Structure formats: C-alpha cells, structure tokens
Amino acid sequence: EVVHFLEGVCFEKLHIEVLNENSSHKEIRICMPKGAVMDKHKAPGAISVQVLEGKIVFEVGDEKIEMPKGALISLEAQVLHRLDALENSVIRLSLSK
Amino acid sequence: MEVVHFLEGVCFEKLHIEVLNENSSHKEIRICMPKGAVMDKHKAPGAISVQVLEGKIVFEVGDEKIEMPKGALISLEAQVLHRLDALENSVIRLSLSKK
C-alpha cells in the first residue's frame, strides 16, 4: 500500500514500471537517463506527469515546456507528447480511468 | 494542460495548504508542512494519494503508522480517517478525487 518512487532507481536504461494501481488511477515510475528520449508516446486516458527528480523537456503540440523538479503537467486523453531528459530524471505518471 | 510547480515558492513558516489545480474529477493540492506540524483526524470525501516530494512525514491510519520518506506514495479509499505528522520540513502532493 506504500510504494517508494525513489527506492531502486537505476539510470542505466530507460525504465517504466507500474508501482501501484487503484480502479481510479495507475501509478507508473519512469527512470530516464540523461539523454533518454520518449517520442510519440500517446496515452489512452488522461495523464499527469511530474518530475520527482532531475529535469526533462515536455513537448506537446508545438511547445517545449521544460519541467524542473516539482513541475507537474496534465494532459487529456489521446494527446501526443514527447519526453527528453536533460538530467537523470525520475518521473511519476498517473494514468486515469 | 496546466503546468504547476510544487517546489516553487515553498515556505516552512506555517502549515500551508493550496489547491494548485482542479478539474471536474480530480484535485491537485500542495501541502507545506513545517517540522513538527500535524494534520490530525482528517476525513477525505474521495480517494486520496499522498506522496512526499521533499522531507519526511509519518502517515497514520487506524492503528498502523507508516513512515514516508521523500518519494514514498500511498493510496486511500474514500471515507478513511488519516493523520499526517512532519518529522522534517516537508512538501506533500495530495491528489483528491471529487466524485
């Protein structure tokens, strides 16, 4: 019932894992090595992306919003986005139902 | 499509609660907890998600007492009584679900 987003972080490869799940959300952790990129990603439901550690650039549509530690962004279902890690980053993705 | 900054403008003088974002179903809240601050006997209407962005707190529900360091996340069901005690200057992100 208690997950640890900063415990077991590895910056060797791009890691995506489901740490926890309710029928309301899905809690996913993303470890991005510096330089890692996640292009074209499209989520089925609404999502909220927050940088727990590090720094990334979030790109949606035309804008490139740089997200430092603590930045949170919400997207609507079926919206095309991209993630570029400016630093070793740990991201928390909350996928909704 | 909003961009909130949980760690921008953090103050540990007082226990601070702010609604950073709100949509028809969810609610994104920041909680700046000074060291030693308490949030006793709290009852949330919907399901909540509590995660420690900075610092350390203890989450208490019923009889069990979970220590939540930086990065720890916890989910609850609606209508569950809980308590938060800050062991260190902490910034908490709470996700409240409305209906």
Side-chain angles (χ1 to χ4, degrees):
Chain A
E1 177 164 313
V2 189
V3 309
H4 291 49
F5 280 79
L6 298 181
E7 156 180 299
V9 175
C10 171
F11 296 114
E12 291 185 30
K13 322 151 174 308
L14 179 57
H15 298 277
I16 298 177
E17 49 201 285
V18 175
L19 294 183
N20 177 54
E21 190 173 357
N22 315 127
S23 82
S24 57
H25 290 265
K26 184 176 298 189
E27 292 303 333
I28 298 171
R29 180 182 64 186
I30 301 179
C31 296
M32 293 191 77
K34 180 179 187 177
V37 180
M38 280 187 73
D39 191 25
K40 305 164 302 193
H41 181 205
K42 177 138 28 66
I47 66 171
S48 67
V49 177
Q50 167 161 42
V51 175
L52 301 179
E53 295 248 317
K55 176 193 291 200
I56 73 156
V57 172
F58 200 85
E59 187 187 319
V60 154
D62 51 276
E63 307 108 28
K64 282 171 193 265
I65 312 153
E66 170 198 310
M67 283 174 62
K69 190 180 188 143
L72 168 60
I73 187 169
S74 301
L75 270 193
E76 300 308 321
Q78 285 287 82
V79 167
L80 204 55
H81 53 290
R82 167 189 195 183
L83 290 77
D84 300 76
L86 296 162
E87 295 295 326
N88 289 331
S89 308
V90 179
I91 307 318
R92 171 198 173 183
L93 189 97
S94 304
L95 211 176
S96 72
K97 328 297 183 67
Chain B
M1 171 59 172
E2 262 264 353
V3 190
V4 307
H5 296 274
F6 276 75
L7 297 183
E8 162 177 302
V10 176
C11 173
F12 298 118
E13 303 285 54
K14 325 151 178 150
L15 175 53
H16 201 355
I17 301 179
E18 327 190 31
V19 174
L20 294 182
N21 182 57
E22 189 179 359
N23 86 304
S24 187
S25 49
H26 208 233
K27 195 173 199 196
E28 291 302 334
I29 300 173
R30 174 179 62 183
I31 304 178
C32 303
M33 290 188 74
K35 181 176 188 176
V38 180
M39 287 187 78
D40 196 28
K41 294 177 75 287
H42 260 265
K43 187 60 148 313
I48 66 172
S49 299
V50 184
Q51 177 184 54
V52 179
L53 301 178
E54 160 189 340
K56 176 204 292 196
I57 75 158
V58 170
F59 200 84
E60 182 185 305
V61 48
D63 54 90
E64 61 206 323
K65 163 181 309 298
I66 313 153
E67 200 204 66
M68 291 176 62
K70 187 186 185 300
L73 171 65
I74 187 168
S75 300
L76 272 195
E77 296 310 315
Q79 295 300 348
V80 172
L81 281 99
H82 55 297
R83 159 181 191 169
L84 290 79
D85 305 77
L87 304 165
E88 292 304 325
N89 290 329
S90 308
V91 182
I92 278 54
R93 171 201 179 184
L94 189 182
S95 301
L96 197 66
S97 75
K98 277 140 137 182
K99 200 251 185 52

